[PDB]
Amino acid sequence: STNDNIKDLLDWYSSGSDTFTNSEVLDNSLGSMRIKNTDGSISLIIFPSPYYSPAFTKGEKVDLNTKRTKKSQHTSEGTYIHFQISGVTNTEKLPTPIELPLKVKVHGKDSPLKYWPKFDKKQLAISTLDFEIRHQLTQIHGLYRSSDKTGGYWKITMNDGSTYQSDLSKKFEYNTEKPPINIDEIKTIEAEIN
Ligand SMILES: [Zn+2]
């Protein structure tokens, strides 16, 4: 039925993000960031895309919602080092959480939701919004699990026409993502499969 192009997308998309908060920055280099989460552990986050370079300085308070590109490390010195790609953002939260309008469609007929989260942030990195949608896709809506369901797209459409998108059939092009958006200004999000 399928091939590595799917087995591997099935892996990365079904698993799960990390979600840290009020972490500090231990250094900011070109497309590279070394943070320290509240729990003593430090993270080596990278930033492919030139459009998306975060300029948070040593001392600031950041939030992660990144994903690990490889299993973690334990130095025989007592410090847990993560290896995660993108996600860093600011600690602005909204007074009372909202749930982003998403609507998965499977070849025509409306597909209802099963356990789609309640968001409390203002600025969510597009890496995050991708992982969410596709995560909720590979799980409840069963994507990358059957030959019948190997492709499609999703579409965020803002409260001022701007649009963003991605094609389920390839991993999010991390090397070209634009900065984190205020999720309260999303008119709608969509997803359609096959
Ligand atoms: Zn330890």
Tally of structural domains, the chain: 2
In which domain, by residue range, is 143 found?
1-17+89-194
| Half-sphere exposure for 21 (CA within 13 Å, toward CB) | 6
> Ligand 1: distance of its center to the CA of 163 in Å?
43
CA-based nearest residue to 67, from 36, 32, 43, 49: 43
Query: What's the CA gap between 80 and 40, in Å, rounded?
Result: 8
Query: Does an H or E element contain 99, and which?
Result: none
Query: What's the CA gap between 186 and 104, in Å, rounded?
Result: 16
Q: Are 46 and 177 in contact (CB under 8 A)?
A: no
Task: Indicate the residue among 57, 88, 119 that finishes a domain.
Answer: 88
Reading the block at residue 188, the tokens are: 């709608």
Q: Give the resolution value in Å.
A: 2.8
Q: Which residues make beta-bridge pairs with 86?
A: none
Task: Indicate the residue among 88, 112, 127 that finishes a domain.
Answer: 88
Give percent helix, percent strand, percent coil of the chain, each to the nearest 5: 15, 35, 50
Q: Are 162 and 155 in contact (CB under 8 A)?
A: no
C-alpha torsion angle, residues 74, 84, 132, 191 (rounded to 10): -140
Task: Indicate the residue among 62, 88, 114 that finishes a domain.
Answer: 88
* 125 shares its domain with 183: yes
* 38 shares its domain with 118: no
> Ligand 1: distance of its center to the CA of 46 in Å?
23
> Ligand 1: distance of its center to the CA of 39 in Å?
10
Query: Does an H or E element contain 153, and which?
Result: strand 152-158
Query: What's the CA gap between 36 and 79, in Å, rounded?
Result: 10
> Ligand 1: distance of its center to the CA of 63 in Å?
21
Q: Is 134 helix (H, G, I), strand (E, B) or coil?
A: helix
Q: Are 117 and 99 in contact (CB under 8 A)?
A: yes
> Ligand 1: distance of its center to the CA of 82 in Å?
12
> Ligand 1: distance of its center to the CA of 74 in Å?
6
> Ligand 1: distance of its center to the CA of 144 in Å?
35
What does DSSP say about strands 186-193 and 104-106: parallel, antiparallel, or unpaired?
parallel
What are the residues whose beta carbons fall under 8 Å from the beta carbon of 4, sequence distance 6 or more? none
> Ligand 1: distance of its center to the CA of 80 in Å?
6
CATH code for the domain in which residue 98 is found? 3.10.20.120
